[PDB]
Amino acid sequence: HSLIHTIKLNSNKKYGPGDMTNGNQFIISKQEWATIGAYIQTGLGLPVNEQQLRTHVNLSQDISIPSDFSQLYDVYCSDKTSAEWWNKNLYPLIIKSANDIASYGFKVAGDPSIDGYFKKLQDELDNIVDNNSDDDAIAKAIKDFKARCGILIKEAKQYEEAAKNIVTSLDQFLHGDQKKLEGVINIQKRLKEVQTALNQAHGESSPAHKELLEKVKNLKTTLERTIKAEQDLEKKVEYSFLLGPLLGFVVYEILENTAVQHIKNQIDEIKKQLDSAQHDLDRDVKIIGMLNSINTDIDNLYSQGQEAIKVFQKLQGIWATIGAQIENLRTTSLQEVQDSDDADEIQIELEDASDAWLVVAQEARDFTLNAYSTCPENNFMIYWYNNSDWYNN
């Protein structure tokens, strides 16, 4: 809370980490990635054929499935693959960019009881402007200084390139990869089209259709508003399928909040109504309710993705500027120090910049520490099927 505000204050400081914040959030935001990841787990567990669909929504074998429902299957496989792709190629990059920030910050700022790289640069300046230093100590110091700065510059450039690479993966995620990868934009468009068709055809069949499907939609809107509202996560990220296929996975921590549990109980009530309902209503409400929630999800995947693109272009800009400032320090500034025989301003700047770096490095460490870690089908839901009240009778 305090930490975010401070980072903004420090953002201007020369030799500093710049503005590593997003809104009220650290630039790699724990809550954001945890939530989006929930939508991804849901995606990864989607069912691609009739039998899989029946098993997933827990629909009786004794119940017939109309033929037009079949269009869902094709779009679901893409959505599932999309989820898998995201899992292999995009999410691990975010962890990496966080780890890089922690590494740089701890290098320049120092150990909790230890000297950081900035402390070494400062002492080297002390030796360069000391009039007792002979030429040799100066030649050595200028050399040590330039080399170490060279290392920071090289790492910064690498991180600049990694953030660029994250932006590129997001563009492929949203727009497809010119390969076997279909863009989310197209998945959203396709999902919506199937939604309209199936809702006209099987949404409106009976008063109870309109009622119950609207009730789930109401629940989905309500759950999400709560999700975007619950800004702070204090625990390790896990996922939960307690709310079942009607709503999808949520971050486990969110279970703690009172409103959601009420939702879990209300969802159990809806479940009770459907399991003994007329078959036609029961099948329609399961499938279209779920499909509707998936559509809300994909809307969030697109929206967040465009945001994340803007964010990592920012982080890229941040690393570029850091490298340019150390390259400036190394050459022009260093020459100025030799000519002026004065290092005090640069030194004080390094003290202040060091302090800002611990702050951002600690945020990066906490993120990584609390981040979730670890089409044949369909193994993925099997454990989940085991664990939800939804699937017991």
From Swiss-Prot:
CDD domains: ClyA_Cry6Aa-like. It is found in: Secreted; Host cell membrane. One of its GO terms (cellular component) is membrane. GO terms for molecular function: toxin activity. GO terms for biological process: killing of cells of another organism; sporulation resulting in formation of a cellular spore. Residues 237-255 are annotated as: Potential transmembrane region for insertion into the host cell membrane. Disulfide bonds join C77-C375. The keyword Secreted applies. Keywords: Disulfide bond, Host cell membrane, Host membrane, Membrane, Secreted, Sporulation, Toxin, Virulence. Gene3D superfamilies: 1.20.1170.10. Interacts with C.elegans aspartic protease asp-1; the interaction prevents Cry6Aa proteolysis by host gut proteases. Pore-forming toxin with nematicidal activity. In infected C.elegans, induces an increase in intracellular Ca(2+) resulting in necrosis of host intestinal cells. Also, induces the expression of aspartic protease asp-1. Belongs to the cry6A endotoxin family. This is Pesticidal crystal protein Cry6Aa. The lineage of its organism: Bacteria, Bacillati, Bacillota, Bacilli, Bacillales.
